[PDB]
């Protein structure tokens, strides 16, 4: 579940795991396909699409989806989630505004995007009716068994985590998640790369002049614009899109 910089995250620009990129109000059926940077779906391991894994800390939190809310000018209706990606039936709206409820906090994310829903037809409704003729609209699927396209999803770059840079009672003290690769030095001269377990820092003292980094590329990410490049390489991780636009007859 990637974490990026939401633009108007309740107050202002936070870093939400559900940071909204690639809003697509381009279909007709009241539907938008969205990508959160969060990867809900199965858990970390193997079970139940209808659970909920975002990033809290450096860490995931693969738990229940209980109180998702996509919304716009009005509250939307979820359609389905798969991967980083959710489909939801929305009305028109100047913006798009997404958010779940972890339980202790609202913890939402919101974004600008021009949305409309013309139905296909010479009638310019604002909303799909219960009746009328069927005719060839453009629309996204409910399903996941989907390969019609795939987007590049290679590694994450590093990320900041100054929870690492503690103090060794006079020196600034870095640690490691699980033996992950922490890329480290300070403005002063000390250890210059950092590919280590928990190091200390001989030279500098201040937490605010050091490289708290997490090269933790055991799991790839979506290639968000709000991602820092993993400078090393274009790793593999070509990964499908579920919600292909299909020729449904709305």
């Amino acid at each position, epitope marked *: 579940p990637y974490i990026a910089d939401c633009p108007n995250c309740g107050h202002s620009r936070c870093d939400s795991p559900i940071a909204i990129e690639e809003v697509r109000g381009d279909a007709h059926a009241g539907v938008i396909r969205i990508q959160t940077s969060a990867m809900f779906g199965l858990k970390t391991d193997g079970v139940d699409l209808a659970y909920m894994s975002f990033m809290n800390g450096k860490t995931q939190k693969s738990i229940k989806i209980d109180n998702l809310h996509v919304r716009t000018s009005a509250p939307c209706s979820l359609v389905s989630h798969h991967g980083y990606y959710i489909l939801a039936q929305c009305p028109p709206g100047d913006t798009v505004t997404v958010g779940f409820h972890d339980g202790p906090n609202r913890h939402t994310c919101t974004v600008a995007h021009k949305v409309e829903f013309r139905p296909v037809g010479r009638e310019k409704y604002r909303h799909p009716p219960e009746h009328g003729v069927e005719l060839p609209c453009n629309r996204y699927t409910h399903k996941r068994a989907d390969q019609g396209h795939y987007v590049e999803m290679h590694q994450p770059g590093l990320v900041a985590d*100054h*929870s690492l*840079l*503690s*103090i*060794h*009672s*006079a*020196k*600034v*003290k870095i*640690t490691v998640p699980s033996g992950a690769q922490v890329k480290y030095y300070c403005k002063c001269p000390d250890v210059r790369e950092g590919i280590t377990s928990s190091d200390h820092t*001989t030279t500098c*003292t*201040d*937490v605010k002049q050091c490289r708290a980094y997490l090269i933790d590329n055991k799991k790839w990410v979506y290639n968000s614009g709000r991602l820092p490049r993993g400078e090393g390489d274009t790793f593999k991780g070509k990964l499908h899109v579920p919600f292909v636009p299909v020729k449904a007859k709305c």
Partner: antibody, heavy 117, light 110 residues
Framework: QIQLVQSGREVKNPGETVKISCKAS????????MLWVKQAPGKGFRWMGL????????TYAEEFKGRFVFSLEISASTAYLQINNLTNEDTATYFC??????????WGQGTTLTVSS | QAVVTQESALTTSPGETVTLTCRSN?????????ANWVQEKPDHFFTGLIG???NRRSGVPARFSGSLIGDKAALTITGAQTEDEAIYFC?????????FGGGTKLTVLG
């Protein structure tokens, strides 16, 4: 396993110098530096500084920069505290300590100095 | 140039759960303060309990755990024992030096 055994307690008249030893056992001296702490009779515990037993560089607490000098008989796994031009208000107990695990894990027995004519 | 503050004395009974705290005069205590807890038994006998907020020194009973509660570092003794009657000192790191708290005298029934 780890034992830091300190010298015995001295008496010294004002003006004198003292060298307090701390002989380390159980660890590799070199990967764990030494904390010197002063627990003054009433006042409680105070950090006097730390010595990098690898390079040999000492840090002094500002209260201790001056008459205090840390050094080490590397070779024998000893760290030493030297307090020169002893002032009468230096009577107290000094502990050596191992810095490890984001804090201090082992403390010595203490060497108590009684500055007195 | 920072003042660590601790409860002065706390009295408990064998079997109880007791919490000691460590407050910093400059602000909330955080993981970059690497809270340490040290115990002093009679005879100038020092042992380290916890370091880096929650790392228990090896051979320190599990009834001892450290954490941050609110804006302070805390030591919890779960199932205090008669043997735990001693002075507990907390230490906080401040980018270049250590500051020790005044210590908490803990008394345990037994």
């Amino acid at each position: 396993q780890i034992q830091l055994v300190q010298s015995g307690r001295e008496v010294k008249n004002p003006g004198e110098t003292v060298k307090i030893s701390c002989k380390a056992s159980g660890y590799t001296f070199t990967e764990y530096p030494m904390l010197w702490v002063k627990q003054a009779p009433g006042k409680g515990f105070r950090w006097m500084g730390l010595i990098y037993t690898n390079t040999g560089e000492p840090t002094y607490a500002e209260e201790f920069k001056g008459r205090f000098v840390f050094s080490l008989e590397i070779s024998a796994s000893t760290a030493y505290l030297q307090i020169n031009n002893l002032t009468n208000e230096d009577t107290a107990t000094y502990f050596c300590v191992r810095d490890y695990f984001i804090s201090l894990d082992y403390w010595g027995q203490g060497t108590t100095l009684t500055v007195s004519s | 140039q920072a003042v660590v503050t601790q409860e002065s004395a706390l009295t408990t009974s064998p079997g109880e759960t007791v919490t000691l705290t460590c407050r910093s005069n400059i602000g909330a205590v955080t993981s970059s303060n690497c809270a340490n807890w040290v115990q002093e038994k009679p005879d100038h006998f020092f042992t380290g309990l916890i370091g880096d907020t929650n790392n228990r020194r090896s051979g320190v009973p599990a009834r001892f755990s450290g954490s941050l509660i609110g804006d302070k570092a805390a030591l919890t003794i779960t199932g205090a024992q008669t043997e735990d009657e001693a002075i507990y000192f907390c230490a906080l790191w401040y980018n270049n030096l250590w500051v020790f708290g005044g210590g908490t005298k803990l008394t345990v029934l037994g």
